[PDB]
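Box 3.1. Reading complex inputs
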Amino acid sequence: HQPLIARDGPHPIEQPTHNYMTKIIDRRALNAAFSLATEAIALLTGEAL
Amino acid sequence: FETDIAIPSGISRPDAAALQRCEGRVVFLPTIRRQLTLADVAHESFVSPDTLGLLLAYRRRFPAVITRVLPTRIVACPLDVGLTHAGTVNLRNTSPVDLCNGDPISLVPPVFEDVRLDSLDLTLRFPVPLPSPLAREIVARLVARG
Amino acid sequence: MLADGFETDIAIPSGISRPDAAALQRCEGRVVFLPTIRRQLTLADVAHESFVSGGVSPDTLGLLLAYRRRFPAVITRVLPTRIVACPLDVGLTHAGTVNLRNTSPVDLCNGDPISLVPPVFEGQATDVRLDSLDLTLRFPVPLPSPLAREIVARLVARG
Amino acid sequence: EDTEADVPVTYGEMVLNGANLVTALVMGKAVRSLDDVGRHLLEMQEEQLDLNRQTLDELESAPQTTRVRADLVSIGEKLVFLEALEKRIYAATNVPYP
Amino acid sequence: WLVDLTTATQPSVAVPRLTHADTRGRPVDGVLVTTAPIKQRLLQSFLKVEDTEADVPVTYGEMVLNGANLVTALVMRSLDDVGRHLLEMQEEQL
Amino acid sequence: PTGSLLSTIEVASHRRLFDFFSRVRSDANSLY
């Protein structure tokens, strides 16, 4: 809203107003790599063949 | 709607009597406003201008007719914004011309013949409410004299 | 009311895009030439489409001569479905005060009589064009009177 | 082939699922006093169900169809209302019949 | 000059649910971000540490679905029961 | 038909209730 101060005498200017503001989302992304060698996956999995 | 022209203090006894006489008389204000000093009304605000300088000034300014006069302030209503709301405002002749019913009345600067307040150090010139078909005559006679 | 004010209703059509609908709301205090004192009119009557003569869209001097054959009105509020105006020849409002807006590059002062002039100046020919309706709205320029007697004299003496 | 038809009387209504707007004044800045804007969302979104549970239960219970006199002519494989409309509507009005 | 940093910016629009505050609960209206040789210089002589431990929100906010398109169908039970299926899905959105 | 497939006819509209109570200055692309 646009705020109001009242004035005396004859009424020169206003009718009460609104403002509809719209703003555009800017999208981004974040990356983080992570590696595991085959020497460790055989420990995380379980039994062998 | 009614404006208030406040008299500044320091009023002598004949000076309150002179402002008491201008009951139904035309006053030019600069801008429509509630608070208004008397010095913007008076002839000091017009600087002395000639008849052409008054005719220019009587179109940039906004005329107002005095209502009742209080001992502290002059209550006047303007002829543009405050008269369409109210019904009827009395107006006094300063003219040698008798007004008839149904005339359209313009105003003329005081060419023919000055309420001066001595304590306040100002003069007051007031226009002459004569009808408009004479106003295009009386100006046109006097220009034809010169 | 009947004497003090007179509200017209310039109707807005159905199909209007929002790039066009958001341009009319910036046209709040303007000057609009009604041909009549009807209470219901359309934008095809207000716009420059109805302004054309038989086939000939006239220039800035003939633009004068079809002003004074019409009725100047001032927009007072732009609603989504209609535009509300007040013709100046009838009466202003109950209060008798309608807000205009400068399109001039020139300041105004107190007590100056306003005459309106076409968009004659350079850097001034701003026509609000509505693309979905093919409508231009050539808004005139409120100038002080001692300018408006110069410009008419500059245009008449040029011909 | 027929003279009297069965015709519905009620108009049709809607299920409103509208984008809602919240304006509420809050006196103070506390946690429980700012969540009342959030409660006002689910207070008003609940009331849209209270309207929409009525408008289905009215249409189930309303008097649906009445009996109307109108000409019915079969052409080919289907029934058709045959109708002339310059005596009911456009009679004694200055309108051209379209 | 530090007042000219803080009085050149017009204050924002949104009021958060949870506010950064003191131990007293007095809210905060901004953040200066400096470098370490500037921050440790401003703290000794120029400025005053009025509080040391702040109150900081922990939970991120979430969303409430405010209105979405009503698209259903049923394979045919009267014809009116498609409407009573529209109310089944709005109740699931509350 | 008992093997048919109905659907709700949807009316999507941009109502503007608050242009009539007060002045608005919105953008050109406000799906408000």
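In summary: The helical segments of chain D are 31-61.
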